[PDB]
């Protein structure tokens, strides 16, 4: 069910915009990180809530 390269770069993009407008963060803290880099670390552990739709 592996994501492509176009879907992986949209899921990060939508999650980095919620994480700036509120949307409380998971365990991602240390010391100062730009909101884009917070989405990369949450995606590394595989705890993204957003799922894709597969049109068929």
């Amino acid at each position: 069910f592996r994501y492509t390269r176009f879907e992986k770069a949209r899921i990060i993009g939508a999650r980095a915009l919620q994480i700036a407008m509120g949307a409380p963060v998971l365990i991602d803290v240390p010391e100062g990180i730009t909101p884009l880099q917070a989405a990369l670390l949450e995606f590394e552990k595989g705890v993204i809530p957003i799922t894709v739709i597969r049109p068929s």
């Binding site: 492509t4 998971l26 957003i50 799922t51 894709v52």
Partner: protein, 388 residues
């Protein structure tokens, strides 16, 4: 370990892999004889399925933009080549960048036609029998059987001159000198050294108008079939090829000795009328491939088979600009920024016309995400959203 054991291990495994793949993988496994036995046979097939699964295209790609840039970059480094080729048969076939424009734009005329002629199974190895085929293909008039014209006094009016060796080295058949009288007007008969003196012994109908007979029989002579240009013979692959000049397809294929099933051509519009559209598909593909290899630098044939299978989209081949595919069906705003003509074209669809969406030049014009790329995916998400 033997044949049955492998074949039926590939047949079962097959379903994710491909058909071409199947034959290839089998024919090497069997071939290799320092042989591997049972367990490593299953390891190879279960590794070959992962690379095919890794190398499929990602859905949403932008194929049409990366086809036009990777075919338009090598045309800037499309410099000169060795114009002093060390060949004989092929001569002056417009090498280089102006060939690439002549194949993309349809252009009914194209300059320097050279049609490859292949020989059959009975005229393959015979040296002198290949010459008589070139006799039948070439064809010569009377005006090129001279070198200049010296005027006579009263009624002979014309003379033939150096040289006579176009009928003793190729064999253009002096029996045809007798034949000249075929449906002609006056046809005088005087052959001293094999050349016909033509007197015009009449009156007011013909008075001094030599110039009107210069388009008739003096030019209408067709000493051989397939009234086209010059023929050169080359030795390739132990067959003789006859790289002629010009393009007269449906006459040339009905010649006793040319192999009809293999003669490829450097013309485009004629292979569609004679061999069909899907042969002219492969005419476009095979011709741009031969231009790229002459210049050293390679382009992949996924990009060529996207242009060629899009330029024959409506049964007759189209050009690429201002009268073809851009001028053909699209959004009406897509035709506005190309072919600066617009008061011809934008005021044409001023009368009774809607325009929906779904180009690439339109959504950028209005402020929307274009359909290609990342504006193709659609998300969905529920909302307790506990942190944990």
């Amino acid at each position: 370990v033997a044949e049955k054991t492998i074949k039926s291990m590939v047949s079962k495994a097959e379903l994710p892999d491909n058909i071409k793949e199947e034959l290839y993988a089998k024919l090497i496994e069997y071939n290799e004889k320092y042989k591997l036995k049972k367990d490593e046979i299953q390891a190879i097939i279960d590794e070959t399925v992962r690379e095919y699964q890794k190398a499929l295209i990602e859905p949403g790609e932008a194929v049409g933009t990366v086809a036009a840039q990777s075919i338009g970059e090598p045309s800037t480094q499309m410099t000169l080549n060795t114009f002093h080729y060390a060949g004989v048969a092929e001569i002056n076939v417009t090498l280089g960048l102006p060939r690439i424009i002549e194949i993309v734009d349809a252009r009914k005329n194209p300059s320097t036609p050279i049609m490859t002629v292949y020989l059959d199974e009975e005229h393959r190895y015979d040296r002198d029998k290949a010459l008589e085929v070139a006799r039948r293909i070439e064809g010569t008039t009377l005006e090129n059987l001279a070198r200049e014209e010296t005027i006579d006094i009263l009624n002979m009016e014309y003379v033939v001159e150096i040289d006579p060796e176009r009928l003793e080295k190729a064999g253009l058949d002096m029996e045809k000198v007798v034949r000249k009288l075929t449906g002609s007007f006056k046809s005088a008969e005087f052959e001293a050294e094999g050349y016909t003196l033509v007197v015009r012994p009449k009156k007011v109908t013909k008075l001094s108008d030599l110039r009107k007979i210069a388009e008739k029989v003096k030019k209408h002579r067709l000493k051989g079939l397939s009234g086209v240009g010059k023929t050169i013979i080359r030795k390739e692959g132990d067959e003789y090829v006859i790289y002629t000049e010009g393009s007269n397809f449906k006459q040339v294929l009905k010649v006793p000795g040319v192999d009809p099933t293999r003669t490829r051509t450097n013309n485009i519009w004629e292979i569609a009328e004679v061999l069909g559209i899907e042969a002219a598909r492969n005419a476009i593909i095979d011709e741009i491939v031969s231009t790229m290899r002459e210049q050293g630098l390679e382009v992949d044939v996924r990009h060529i088979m996207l242009v060629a299978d899009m330029m024959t989209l409506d049964g007759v081949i189209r050009p690429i600009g201002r009268h073809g595919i851009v001028g053909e069906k699209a959004s009406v705003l897509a035709r506005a920024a190309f072919e600066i003509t617009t008061q011809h074209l934008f005021a044409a669809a001023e009368r009774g016309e809607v325009d929906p969406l779904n180009g690439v030049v339109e959504n950028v014009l209005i402020g929307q995400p274009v359909p290609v790329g990342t504006g193709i995916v659609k998300l969905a998400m529920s909302l307790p959203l506990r942190p944990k």
